[PDB]
mmCIF file with all atom_site columns, C-alpha atoms in Angstrom:
data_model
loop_
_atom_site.group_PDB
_atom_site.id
_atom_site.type_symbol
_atom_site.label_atom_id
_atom_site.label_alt_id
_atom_site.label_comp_id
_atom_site.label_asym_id
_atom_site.label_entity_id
_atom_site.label_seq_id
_atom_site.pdbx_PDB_ins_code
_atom_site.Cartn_x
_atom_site.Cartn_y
_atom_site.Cartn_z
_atom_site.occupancy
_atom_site.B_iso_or_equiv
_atom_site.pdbx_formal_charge
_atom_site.auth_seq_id
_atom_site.auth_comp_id
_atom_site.auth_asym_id
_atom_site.auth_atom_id
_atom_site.pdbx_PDB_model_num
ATOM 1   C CA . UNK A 1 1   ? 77.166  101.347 112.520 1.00 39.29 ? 1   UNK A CA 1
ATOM 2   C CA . UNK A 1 2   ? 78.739  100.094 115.532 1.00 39.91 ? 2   UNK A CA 1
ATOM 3   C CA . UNK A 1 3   ? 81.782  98.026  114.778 1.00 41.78 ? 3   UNK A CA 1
ATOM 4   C CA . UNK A 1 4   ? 82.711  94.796  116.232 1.00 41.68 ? 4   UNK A CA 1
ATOM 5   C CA . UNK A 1 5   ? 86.423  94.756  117.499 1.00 40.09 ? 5   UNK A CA 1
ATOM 6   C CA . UNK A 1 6   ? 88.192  92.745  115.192 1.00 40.47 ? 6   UNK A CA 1
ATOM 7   C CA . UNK A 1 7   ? 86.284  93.873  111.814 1.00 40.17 ? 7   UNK A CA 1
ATOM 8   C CA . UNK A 1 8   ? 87.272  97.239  113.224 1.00 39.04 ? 8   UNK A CA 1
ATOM 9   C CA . UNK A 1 9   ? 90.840  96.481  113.396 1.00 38.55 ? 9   UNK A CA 1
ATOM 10  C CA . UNK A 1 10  ? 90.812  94.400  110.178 1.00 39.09 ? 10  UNK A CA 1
ATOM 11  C CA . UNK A 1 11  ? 89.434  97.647  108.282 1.00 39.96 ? 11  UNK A CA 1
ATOM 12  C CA . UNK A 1 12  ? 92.042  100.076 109.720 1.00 40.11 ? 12  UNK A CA 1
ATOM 13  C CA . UNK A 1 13  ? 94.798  98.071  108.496 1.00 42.99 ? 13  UNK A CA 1
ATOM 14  C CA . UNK A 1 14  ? 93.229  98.153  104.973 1.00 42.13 ? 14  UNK A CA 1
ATOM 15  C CA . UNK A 1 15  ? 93.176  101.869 105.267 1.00 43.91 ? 15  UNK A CA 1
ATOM 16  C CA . UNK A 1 16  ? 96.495  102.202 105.995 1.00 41.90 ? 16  UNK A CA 1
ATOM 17  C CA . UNK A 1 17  ? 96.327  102.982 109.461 1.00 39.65 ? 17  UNK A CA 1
ATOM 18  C CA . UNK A 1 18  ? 98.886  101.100 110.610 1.00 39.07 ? 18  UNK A CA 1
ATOM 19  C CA . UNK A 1 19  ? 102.509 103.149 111.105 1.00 41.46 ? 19  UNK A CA 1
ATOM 20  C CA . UNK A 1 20  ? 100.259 105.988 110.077 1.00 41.85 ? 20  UNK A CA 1
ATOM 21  C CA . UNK A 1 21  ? 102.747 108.829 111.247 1.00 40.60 ? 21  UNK A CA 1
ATOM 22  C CA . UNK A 1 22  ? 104.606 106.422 114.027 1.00 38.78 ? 22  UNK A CA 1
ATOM 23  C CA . UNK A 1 23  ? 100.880 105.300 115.098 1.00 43.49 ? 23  UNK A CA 1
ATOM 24  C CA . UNK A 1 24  ? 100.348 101.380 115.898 1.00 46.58 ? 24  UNK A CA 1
ATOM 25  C CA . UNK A 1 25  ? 97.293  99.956  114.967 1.00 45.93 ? 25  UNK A CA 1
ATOM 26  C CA . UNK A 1 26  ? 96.291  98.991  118.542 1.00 44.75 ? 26  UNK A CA 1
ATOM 27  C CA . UNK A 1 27  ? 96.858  102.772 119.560 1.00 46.80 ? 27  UNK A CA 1
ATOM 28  C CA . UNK A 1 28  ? 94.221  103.717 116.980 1.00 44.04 ? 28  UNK A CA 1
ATOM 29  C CA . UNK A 1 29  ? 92.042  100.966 118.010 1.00 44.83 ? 29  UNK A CA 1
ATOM 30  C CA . UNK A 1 30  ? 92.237  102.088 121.736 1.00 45.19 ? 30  UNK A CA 1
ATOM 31  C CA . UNK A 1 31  ? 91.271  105.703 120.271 1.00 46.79 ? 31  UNK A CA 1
ATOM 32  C CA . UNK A 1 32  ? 87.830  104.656 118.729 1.00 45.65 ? 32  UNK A CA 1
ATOM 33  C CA . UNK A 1 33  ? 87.203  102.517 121.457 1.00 43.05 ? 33  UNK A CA 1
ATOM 34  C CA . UNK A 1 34  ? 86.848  105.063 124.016 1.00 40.70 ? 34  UNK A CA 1
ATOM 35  C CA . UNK A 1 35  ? 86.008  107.843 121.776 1.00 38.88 ? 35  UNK A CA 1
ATOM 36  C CA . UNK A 1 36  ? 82.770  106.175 120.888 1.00 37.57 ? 36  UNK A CA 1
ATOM 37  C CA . UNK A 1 37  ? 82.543  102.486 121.558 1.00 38.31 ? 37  UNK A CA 1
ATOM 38  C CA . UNK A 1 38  ? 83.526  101.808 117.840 1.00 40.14 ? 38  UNK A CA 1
ATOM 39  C CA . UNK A 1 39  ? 80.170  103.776 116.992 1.00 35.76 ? 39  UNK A CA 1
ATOM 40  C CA . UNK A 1 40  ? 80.245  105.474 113.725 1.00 38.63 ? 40  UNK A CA 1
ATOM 41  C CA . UNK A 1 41  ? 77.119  107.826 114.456 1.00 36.62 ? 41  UNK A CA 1
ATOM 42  C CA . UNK A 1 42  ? 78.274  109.095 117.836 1.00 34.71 ? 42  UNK A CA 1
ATOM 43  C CA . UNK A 1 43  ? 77.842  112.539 118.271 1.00 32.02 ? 43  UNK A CA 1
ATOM 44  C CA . UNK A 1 44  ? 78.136  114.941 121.592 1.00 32.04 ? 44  UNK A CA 1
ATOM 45  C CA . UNK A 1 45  ? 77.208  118.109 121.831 1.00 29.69 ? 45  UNK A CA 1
ATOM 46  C CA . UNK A 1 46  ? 79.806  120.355 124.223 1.00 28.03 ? 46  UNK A CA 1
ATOM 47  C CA . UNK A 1 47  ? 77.579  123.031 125.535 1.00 26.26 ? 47  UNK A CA 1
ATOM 48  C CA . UNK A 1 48  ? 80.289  125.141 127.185 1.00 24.46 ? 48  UNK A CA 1
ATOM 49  C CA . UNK A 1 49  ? 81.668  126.036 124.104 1.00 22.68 ? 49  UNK A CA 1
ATOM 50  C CA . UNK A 1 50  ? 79.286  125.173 121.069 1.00 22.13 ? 50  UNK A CA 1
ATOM 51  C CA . UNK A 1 51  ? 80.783  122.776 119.389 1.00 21.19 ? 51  UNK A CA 1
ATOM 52  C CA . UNK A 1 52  ? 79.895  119.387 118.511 1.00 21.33 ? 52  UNK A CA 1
ATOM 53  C CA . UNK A 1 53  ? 82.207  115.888 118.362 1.00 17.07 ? 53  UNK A CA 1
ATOM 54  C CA . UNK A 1 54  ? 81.471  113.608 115.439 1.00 17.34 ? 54  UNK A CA 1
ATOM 55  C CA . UNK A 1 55  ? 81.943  109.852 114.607 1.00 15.00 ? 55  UNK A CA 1
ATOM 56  C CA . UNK A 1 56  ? 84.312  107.234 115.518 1.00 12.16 ? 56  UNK A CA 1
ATOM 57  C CA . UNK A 1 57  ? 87.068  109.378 116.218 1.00 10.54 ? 57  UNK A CA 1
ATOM 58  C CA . UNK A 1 58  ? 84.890  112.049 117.951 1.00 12.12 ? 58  UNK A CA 1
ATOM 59  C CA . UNK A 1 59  ? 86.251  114.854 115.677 1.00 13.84 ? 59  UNK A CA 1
ATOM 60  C CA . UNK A 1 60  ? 85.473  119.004 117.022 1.00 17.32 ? 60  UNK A CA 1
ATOM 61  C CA . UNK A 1 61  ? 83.250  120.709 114.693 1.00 20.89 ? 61  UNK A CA 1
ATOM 62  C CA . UNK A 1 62  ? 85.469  123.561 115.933 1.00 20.91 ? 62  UNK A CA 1
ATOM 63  C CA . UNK A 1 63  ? 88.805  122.180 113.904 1.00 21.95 ? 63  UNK A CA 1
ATOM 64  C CA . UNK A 1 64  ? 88.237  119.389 111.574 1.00 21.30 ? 64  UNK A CA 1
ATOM 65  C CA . UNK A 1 65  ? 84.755  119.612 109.841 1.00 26.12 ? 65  UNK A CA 1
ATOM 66  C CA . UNK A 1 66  ? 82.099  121.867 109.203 1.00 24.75 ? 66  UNK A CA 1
ATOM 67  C CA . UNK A 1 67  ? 78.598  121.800 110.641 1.00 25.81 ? 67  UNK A CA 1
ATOM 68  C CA . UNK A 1 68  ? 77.901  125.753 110.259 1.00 21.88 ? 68  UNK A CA 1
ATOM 69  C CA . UNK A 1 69  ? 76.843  126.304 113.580 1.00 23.91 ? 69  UNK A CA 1
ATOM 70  C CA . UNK A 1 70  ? 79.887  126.210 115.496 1.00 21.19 ? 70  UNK A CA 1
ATOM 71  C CA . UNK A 1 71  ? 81.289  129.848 115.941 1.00 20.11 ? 71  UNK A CA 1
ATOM 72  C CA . UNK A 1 72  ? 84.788  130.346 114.607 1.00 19.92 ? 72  UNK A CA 1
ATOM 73  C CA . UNK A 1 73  ? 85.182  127.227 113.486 1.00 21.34 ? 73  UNK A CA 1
ATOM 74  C CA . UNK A 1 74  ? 87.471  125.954 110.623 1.00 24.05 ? 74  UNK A CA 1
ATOM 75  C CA . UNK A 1 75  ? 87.371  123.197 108.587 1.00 26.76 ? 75  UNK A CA 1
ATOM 76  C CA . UNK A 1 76  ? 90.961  121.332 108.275 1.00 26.23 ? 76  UNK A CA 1
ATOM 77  C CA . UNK A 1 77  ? 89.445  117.675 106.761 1.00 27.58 ? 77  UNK A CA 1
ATOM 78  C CA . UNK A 1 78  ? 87.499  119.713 104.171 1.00 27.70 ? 78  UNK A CA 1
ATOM 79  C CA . UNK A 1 79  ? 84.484  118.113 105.333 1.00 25.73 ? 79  UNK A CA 1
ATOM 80  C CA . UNK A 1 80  ? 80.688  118.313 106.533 1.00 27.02 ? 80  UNK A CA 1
ATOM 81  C CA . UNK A 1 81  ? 80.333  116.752 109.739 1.00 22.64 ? 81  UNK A CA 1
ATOM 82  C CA . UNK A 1 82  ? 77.984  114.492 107.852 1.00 21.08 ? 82  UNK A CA 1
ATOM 83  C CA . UNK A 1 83  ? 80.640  112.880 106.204 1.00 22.42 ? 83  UNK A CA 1
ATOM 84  C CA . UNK A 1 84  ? 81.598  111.555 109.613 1.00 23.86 ? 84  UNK A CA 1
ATOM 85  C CA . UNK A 1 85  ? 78.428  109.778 110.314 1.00 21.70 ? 85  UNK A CA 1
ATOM 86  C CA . UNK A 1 86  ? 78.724  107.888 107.449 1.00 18.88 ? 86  UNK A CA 1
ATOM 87  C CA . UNK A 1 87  ? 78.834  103.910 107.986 1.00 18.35 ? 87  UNK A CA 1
ATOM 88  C CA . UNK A 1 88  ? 81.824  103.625 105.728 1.00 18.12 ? 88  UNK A CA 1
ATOM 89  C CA . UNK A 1 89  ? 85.030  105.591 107.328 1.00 13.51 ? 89  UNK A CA 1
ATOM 90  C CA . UNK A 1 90  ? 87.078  106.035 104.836 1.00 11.30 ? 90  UNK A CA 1
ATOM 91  C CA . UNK A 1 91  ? 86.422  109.599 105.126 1.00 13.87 ? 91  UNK A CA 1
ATOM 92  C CA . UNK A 1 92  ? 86.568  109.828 108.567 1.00 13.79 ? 92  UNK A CA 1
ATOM 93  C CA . UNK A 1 93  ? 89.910  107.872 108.576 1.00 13.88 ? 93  UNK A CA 1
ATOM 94  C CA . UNK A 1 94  ? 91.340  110.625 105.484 1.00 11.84 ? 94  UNK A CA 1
ATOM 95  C CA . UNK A 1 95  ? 90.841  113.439 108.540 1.00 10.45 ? 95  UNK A CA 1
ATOM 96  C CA . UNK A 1 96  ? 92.242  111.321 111.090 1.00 9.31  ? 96  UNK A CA 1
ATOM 97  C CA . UNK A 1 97  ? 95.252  110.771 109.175 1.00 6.94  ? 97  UNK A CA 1
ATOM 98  C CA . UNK A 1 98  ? 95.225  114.886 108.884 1.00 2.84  ? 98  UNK A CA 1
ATOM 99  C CA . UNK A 1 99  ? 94.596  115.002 112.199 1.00 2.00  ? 99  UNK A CA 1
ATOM 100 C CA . UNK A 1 100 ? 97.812  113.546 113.077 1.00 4.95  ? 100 UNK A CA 1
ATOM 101 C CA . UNK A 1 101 ? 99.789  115.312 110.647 1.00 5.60  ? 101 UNK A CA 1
ATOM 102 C CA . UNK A 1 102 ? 100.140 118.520 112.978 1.00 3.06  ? 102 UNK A CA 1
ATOM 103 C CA . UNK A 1 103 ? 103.206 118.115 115.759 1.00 2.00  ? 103 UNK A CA 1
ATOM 104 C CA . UNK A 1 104 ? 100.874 117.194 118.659 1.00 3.41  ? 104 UNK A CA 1
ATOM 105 C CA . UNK A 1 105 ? 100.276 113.739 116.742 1.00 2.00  ? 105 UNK A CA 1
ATOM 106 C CA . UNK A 1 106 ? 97.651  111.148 118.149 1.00 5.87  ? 106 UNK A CA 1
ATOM 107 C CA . UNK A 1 107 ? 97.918  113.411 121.703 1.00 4.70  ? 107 UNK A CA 1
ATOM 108 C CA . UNK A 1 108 ? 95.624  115.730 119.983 1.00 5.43  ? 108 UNK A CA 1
ATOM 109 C CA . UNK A 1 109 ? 92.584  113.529 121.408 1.00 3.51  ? 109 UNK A CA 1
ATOM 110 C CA . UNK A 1 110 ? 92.771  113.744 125.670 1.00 2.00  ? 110 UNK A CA 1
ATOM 111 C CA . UNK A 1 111 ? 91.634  110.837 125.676 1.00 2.00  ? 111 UNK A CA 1
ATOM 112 C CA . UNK A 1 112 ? 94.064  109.037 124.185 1.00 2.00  ? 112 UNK A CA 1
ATOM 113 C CA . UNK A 1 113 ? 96.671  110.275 126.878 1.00 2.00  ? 113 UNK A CA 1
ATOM 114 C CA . UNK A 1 114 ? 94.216  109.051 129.881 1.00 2.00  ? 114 UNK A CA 1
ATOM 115 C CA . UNK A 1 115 ? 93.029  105.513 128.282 1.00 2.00  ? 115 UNK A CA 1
ATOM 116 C CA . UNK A 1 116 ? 96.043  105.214 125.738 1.00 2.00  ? 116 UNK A CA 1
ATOM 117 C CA . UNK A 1 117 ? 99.165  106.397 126.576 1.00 2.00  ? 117 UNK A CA 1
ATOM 118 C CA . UNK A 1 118 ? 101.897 104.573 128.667 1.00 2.00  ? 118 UNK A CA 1
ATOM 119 C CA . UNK A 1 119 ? 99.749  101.528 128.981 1.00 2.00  ? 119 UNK A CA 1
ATOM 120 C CA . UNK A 1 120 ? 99.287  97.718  127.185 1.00 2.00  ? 120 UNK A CA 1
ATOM 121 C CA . UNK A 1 121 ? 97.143  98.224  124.082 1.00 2.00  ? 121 UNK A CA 1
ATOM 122 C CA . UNK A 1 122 ? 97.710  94.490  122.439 1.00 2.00  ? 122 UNK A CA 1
ATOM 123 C CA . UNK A 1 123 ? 94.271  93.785  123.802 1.00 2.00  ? 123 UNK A CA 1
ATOM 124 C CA . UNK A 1 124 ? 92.599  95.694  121.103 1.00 2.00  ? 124 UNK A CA 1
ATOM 125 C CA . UNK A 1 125 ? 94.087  94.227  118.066 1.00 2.00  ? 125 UNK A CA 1
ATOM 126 C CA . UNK A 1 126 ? 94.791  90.260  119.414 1.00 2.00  ? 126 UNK A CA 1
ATOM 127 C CA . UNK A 1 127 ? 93.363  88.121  117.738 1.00 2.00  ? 127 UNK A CA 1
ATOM 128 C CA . UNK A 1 128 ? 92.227  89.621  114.798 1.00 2.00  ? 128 UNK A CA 1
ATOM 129 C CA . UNK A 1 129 ? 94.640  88.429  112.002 1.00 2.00  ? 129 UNK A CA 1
ATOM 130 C CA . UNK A 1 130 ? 96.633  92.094  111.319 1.00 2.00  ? 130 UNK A CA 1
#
């Protein structure tokens, strides 16, 4: 499924995304937005080291979810990577939540610190009603 801004946003909040660990709502929205374009069955295969990113959030089969092909891979959202192509994301939003649990917080994603960080995110949530 590929979300439309403010349903996106509207859904977060629902989730209890908002404050999540110190994270706005607009900082999550940025996130998805360049992670995948608010697609929910994005996936990307990184050939350099064998893993795959899955979902909205792009998660590493390497880390949060397993896919059994990745080599020395763990499994942190005690999850198959099919669980994050799902149209619903309320899985995919329980591992981002775990995601951010660990000290490096919503940095874990690069992108987040070259689209993200330091900059004005309202644009993503106004006008949505949250």
């Amino acid at each position: 499924k590929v979300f439309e801004r403010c349903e996106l946003a509207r859904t977060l909040k629902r989730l209890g995304m908002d404050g999540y660990r110190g994270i706005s709502l607009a900082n999550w929205m940025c996130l998805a937005k360049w992670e995948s374009g608010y697609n929910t069955r994005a996936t990307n295969y990184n050939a350099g080291d064998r893993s795959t990113d899955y979902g909205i959030f792009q998660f590493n089969s390497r880390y949060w979810c397993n896919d059994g092909k990745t080599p020395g891979a763990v499994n942190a959202c005690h999850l198959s990577c099919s669980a994050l192509l799902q149209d619903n994301i309320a899985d995919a939003v329980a591992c981002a939540k775990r995601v951010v649990r660990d000290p490096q917080g919503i940095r874990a994603w690069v992108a987040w610190r070259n689209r993200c960080q330091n900059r004005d995110v309202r644009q993503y949530v106004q006008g949505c009603g949250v």
